[PDB]
With several copies, the nearest count.
Chain A
Amino acid sequence: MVQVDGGRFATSDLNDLYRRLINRNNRLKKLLAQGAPEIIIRNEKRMLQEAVDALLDNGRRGAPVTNPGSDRPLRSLTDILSGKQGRFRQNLLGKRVDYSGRSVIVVGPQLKLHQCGLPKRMALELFKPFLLKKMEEKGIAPNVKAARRMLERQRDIKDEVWDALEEVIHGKVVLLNRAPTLHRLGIQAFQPVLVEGQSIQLHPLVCEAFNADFDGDQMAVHVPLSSFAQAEARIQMLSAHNLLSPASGEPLAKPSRDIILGL
């Protein structure tokens, strides 16, 4: 039962289900203590059973319990743990991740097969802790807090921050992702190249693997952190290393429309 920034209270439906269960249980206890007739006690016991049911699995038996003033069924534990929006498929099998960005993709014909065009501001935000460490190493900032304060305001960023960022990303790779990830090459590791602009530059030869054209497709960027993650991305997930299709064994990064036309 949290208080939002506006002072309003937001609570879950489990609180309502628990309140109904407790009210019915206490009223049954009072009725039993008063020697109520068998009809009243039977009705209250039946309501107690139905409240327990609604708490455990709302809507399984009878009319779903809804919050008064609305027709939306209350979310029970079973609904919390089941379905596409349940705990398993929404928070366990898949999660939202830190050090992740997203932007529109454009074609980079000058890129190498293992390279991508990463915007400077996206790289600055994605590699923020590494950038703060590098800034502290040099004379840009005295400590990490001062570096973060410097990076808070766009007009306070000096020109050496970009040099430090270029130093940071050296050797590292990022995972480019396009949805839906139908096969495994829907996520590919690329060596980022800092570019001026706001759009991600994609190598043409990987487009067929990504099923990506440039009529408005967007891609996500993920930053592996440790030595294991970087090694896995650079060795196993690198675009220049996955050249053949795992489905058939034929090349998947191969010449495409304009390349084929010219040749």
Chain B
Amino acid sequence: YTGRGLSFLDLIQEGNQGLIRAVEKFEYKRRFKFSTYATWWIRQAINRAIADQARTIRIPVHMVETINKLSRTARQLQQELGREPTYEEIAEAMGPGWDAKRVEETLKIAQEPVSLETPIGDEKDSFYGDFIPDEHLPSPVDAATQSLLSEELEKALSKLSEREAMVLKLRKGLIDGREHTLEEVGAFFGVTRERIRQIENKALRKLKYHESRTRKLRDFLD
């Protein structure tokens, strides 16, 4: 079983677990030799361990069996046709319920991750991770434009009334971080929901009027 993702000693230890199970479940009344019944369990344990531990991104056992069967079918068709089969042939040979789309999805699933320390060039000084940008943390430009938008929005909300600005900054989650509902803002102010939506609409219209008269906030909309 060597060369299938697990080292020799790991296979040996997994087979040892299978052998322990075989000893537990062996019956000598049947007059069969121990190797005959123990081989089943040892191979079972080794194959289960290969299915469970040979991939960095673990794949369920049924899916591993599907991938192995698909690879066997592809190899058989490749040796029979004298060329690399397309997904249609492979799907047809797999059987009912298989089309080219499912074969492609299974092959995409079966793609092992590539090491970040794999060398690029002939010197081997450069690696994959040296060419992969980090797209999680915002760039300085993104943080700067977010701060600019916050400043301009704070300046724009100044022209509004004292209460209307608060209503919009609460409904849009500019204070607590999360949007509030009309009933919640009412419980904060003691006012019913209809008046809150009316005043929010009026203040939004006023902000639109100020933006039209100034045009100092349109660029941030992208």
- Asked if A8 contacts B9 (CB within 8 A), the reply is no
Which of the 9-residue segments A9-17, A170-178, A223-231 touches chain B? A9-17
Give the residue name and chain of the B residue nearest to A22 (CB): B53
- Across-interface contacts of A149 in B (CB, < 8 A): 219
Answer whether residue B175 sits at the interface, using C-beta atoms and an 8 A cutoff: no
Answer whether residue A143 sits at the interface, using C-beta atoms and an 8 A cutoff: yes
- Asked if A145 contacts B220 (CB within 8 A), the reply is yes
Cβ proximity bits A1-35 to B, threshold 8 Å, 1 near / 0 not: 11010011111110110010001100100110010
- Asked if B13 contacts A40 (CB within 8 A), the reply is yes
Query: Known contacts being A8-B111, A146-B219, is A23 close to B118, with CB within 8 Å?
Result: no
Answer whether residue A245 sits at the interface, using C-beta atoms and an 8 A cutoff: no
- Asked if A9 contacts B13 (CB within 8 A), the reply is no
Answer whether residue B141 sits at the interface, using C-beta atoms and an 8 A cutoff: yes
Answer whether residue B106 sits at the interface, using C-beta atoms and an 8 A cutoff: no
- Asked if B115 contacts A34 (CB within 8 A), the reply is no
- Asked if A144 contacts B111 (CB within 8 A), the reply is no
Cβ proximity bits B77-109 to A, threshold 8 Å, 1 near / 0 not: 000000000000000000000000000000010
- Asked if B129 contacts A68 (CB within 8 A), the reply is no
Answer whether residue B40 sits at the interface, using C-beta atoms and an 8 A cutoff: no
Query: Known contacts being A10-B129, A27-B13, A36-B16, is A145 close to B117, with CB within 8 Å?
Result: no
Selected from A8, A15, A145, A148, the residue in CB contact (under 8 A) with B114 is A8
- Asked if B144 contacts A144 (CB within 8 A), the reply is yes
- Asked if B113 contacts A43 (CB within 8 A), the reply is no
B120-139 residues with Cβ-Cβ distance < 8 A to A are: 125, 128-129, 132
Query: Known contacts being A19-B56, A23-B53, A40-B16, is A10 close to B132, with CB within 8 Å?
Result: yes
- Asked if A12 contacts B115 (CB within 8 A), the reply is yes
- Asked if A43 contacts B132 (CB within 8 A), the reply is no
Q: Min CB distance, B5 to chain A, in Å?
A: 5
- Across-interface contacts of A11 in B (CB, < 8 A): 56, 113-116
Give the residue name and chain of the A residue nearest to B119 (CB): A72
Answer whether residue A253 sits at the interface, using C-beta atoms and an 8 A cutoff: no
Give the residue name and chain of the B residue nearest to A67 (CB): B115
A94-147 residues with Cβ-Cβ distance < 8 A to B are: 142-146
- Asked if A145 contacts B17 (CB within 8 A), the reply is no
Selected from B7, B9, B14, B116, the residue in CB contact (under 8 A) with A10 is B116
Q: Min CB distance, B118 to chain A, in Å?
A: 7
Q: Min CB distance, A16 to chain B, in Å?
A: 6
- Asked if B17 contacts A31 (CB within 8 A), the reply is yes
Answer whether residue B211 sits at the interface, using C-beta atoms and an 8 A cutoff: no
Give the residue name and chain of the B residue nearest to A2 (CB): B132
Query: Known contacts being A10-B129, A31-B17, A47-B13, is A144 close to B118, with CB within 8 Å?
Result: no
Query: Known contacts being A10-B113, A11-B116, A23-B10, is A4 close to B17, with CB within 8 Å?
Result: no
B1-56 residues with Cβ-Cβ distance < 8 A to A are: 3-7, 9-10, 12-14, 16-17, 20, 53-54, 56
- Asked if B10 contacts A142 (CB within 8 A), the reply is no
Q: Min CB distance, A18 to chain B, in Å?
A: 10
Answer whether residue A75 sits at the interface, using C-beta atoms and an 8 A cutoff: yes
- Across-interface contacts of B145 in A (CB, < 8 A): 144-145
Answer whether residue B216 sits at the interface, using C-beta atoms and an 8 A cutoff: yes
- Asked if B148 contacts A10 (CB within 8 A), the reply is no
- Across-interface contacts of A68 in B (CB, < 8 A): 3-7, 54
Selected from B3, B9, B20, B115, the residue in CB contact (under 8 A) with A47 is B9
Q: Which of B54, B56, B119 has the most CB of A within 10 A?
A: B56
Q: Min CB distance, A37 to chain B, in Å?
A: 9
Cβ proximity bits B46-74 to A, threshold 8 Å, 1 near / 0 not: 00000001101100000000000000000
Query: Known contacts being A27-B17, A144-B144, is A12 close to B53, with CB within 8 Å?
Result: no
Q: Other CB < 8 Å A-B pairs besides A67-B115, A68-B3, 20 of them?
A: A8-B114, A9-B113, A10-B114, A10-B128, A11-B115, A11-B116, A15-B56, A27-B13, A30-B17, A31-B16, A40-B13, A40-B16, A43-B13, A47-B10, A68-B7, A68-B54, A72-B115, A72-B118, A75-B117, A143-B220
A-B CB contact pairs (8 Å), 12 listed: A1-B56, A12-B129, A13-B117, A31-B16, A34-B17, A47-B9, A47-B13, A85-B125, A142-B216, A144-B144, A145-B148, A146-B219
* B residues in contact (CB < 8 Å) with A: 3-7, 9-10, 12-14, 16-17, 20, 53-54, 56-57, 108, 111, 113-119, 125, 128-129, 132, 141, 144-145, 148, 215-216, 219-220
